Amino acid sequence: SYDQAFLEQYEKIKDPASGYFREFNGLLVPYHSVETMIVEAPDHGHQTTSEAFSYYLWLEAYYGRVTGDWKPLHDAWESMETFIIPGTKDQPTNSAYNPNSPATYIPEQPNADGYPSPLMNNVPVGQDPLAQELSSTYGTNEIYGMHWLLDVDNVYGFGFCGDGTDDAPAYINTYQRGARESVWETIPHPSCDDFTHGGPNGYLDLFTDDQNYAKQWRYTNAPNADARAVQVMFWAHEWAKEQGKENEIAGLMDKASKMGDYLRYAMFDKYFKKIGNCVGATSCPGGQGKDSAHYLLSWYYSWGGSLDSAWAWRIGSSSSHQGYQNVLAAYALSQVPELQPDSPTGVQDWATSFDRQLEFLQWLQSAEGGIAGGATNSWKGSYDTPPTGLSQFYGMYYDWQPVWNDPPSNNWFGFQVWNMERVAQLYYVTGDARAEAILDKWVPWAIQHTDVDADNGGQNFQVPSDLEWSGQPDTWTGTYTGNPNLHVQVVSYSQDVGVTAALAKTLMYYAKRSGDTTALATAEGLLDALLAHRDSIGIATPEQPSWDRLDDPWDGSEGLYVPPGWSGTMPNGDRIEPGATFLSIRSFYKNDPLWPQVEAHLNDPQNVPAPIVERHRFWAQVEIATAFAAHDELFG
Ligand SMILES: OC[C@H]1O[C@@H](O[C@H]2[C@H](O)[C@@H](O)[C@H](O[C@H]3[C@H](O)[C@@H](O)[C@H](O[C@H]4[C@H](O)[C@@H](O)[C@H](O[C@H]5[C@H](O)[C@@H](O)[C@H](O[C@H]6[C@H](O)[C@@H](O)[C@H](O)O[C@@H]6CO)O[C@@H]5CO)O[C@@H]4CO)O[C@@H]3CO)O[C@@H]2CO)[C@H](O)[C@@H](O)[C@@H]1O
Ligand SMILES: OC[C@H]1O[C@@H](O[C@H]2[C@H](O)[C@@H](O)[C@@H](O)O[C@@H]2CO)[C@H](O)[C@@H](O)[C@@H]1O
Ligand SMILES: [Ca+2]
Ligand SMILES: [Ca+2]
Ligand SMILES: [Ca+2]
Ligand SMILES: [Ca+2]
Ligand SMILES: [Fe+3]
Ligand SMILES: [Fe+3]
Ligand SMILES: [Fe+3]
Ligand SMILES: [Fe+3]
Ligand code: NA
Ligand code: NA
Ligand code: NA
Ligand SMILES: [Zn+2]
Ligand SMILES: [Zn+2]
Ligand SMILES: [Zn+2]
Ligand SMILES: [Zn+2]
Ligand SMILES: [Zn+2]
Ligand SMILES: [Zn+2]
Ligand SMILES: [Zn+2]
Ligand SMILES: [Zn+2]
Ligand SMILES: [Zn+2]
Ligand SMILES: [Zn+2]
Ligand SMILES: [Zn+2]
Ligand SMILES: [Zn+2]
Ligand SMILES: [Zn+2]
Ligand SMILES: [Zn+2]
Ligand SMILES: [Zn+2]
Ligand SMILES: [Zn+2]
Ligand SMILES: [Zn+2]
Ligand SMILES: [Zn+2]
Ligand SMILES: [Zn+2]
Question: Which of 177, 224, 241, 424 shows the smallest number of beta carbons within 10 Å?
Answer without folding.
Answer: 241
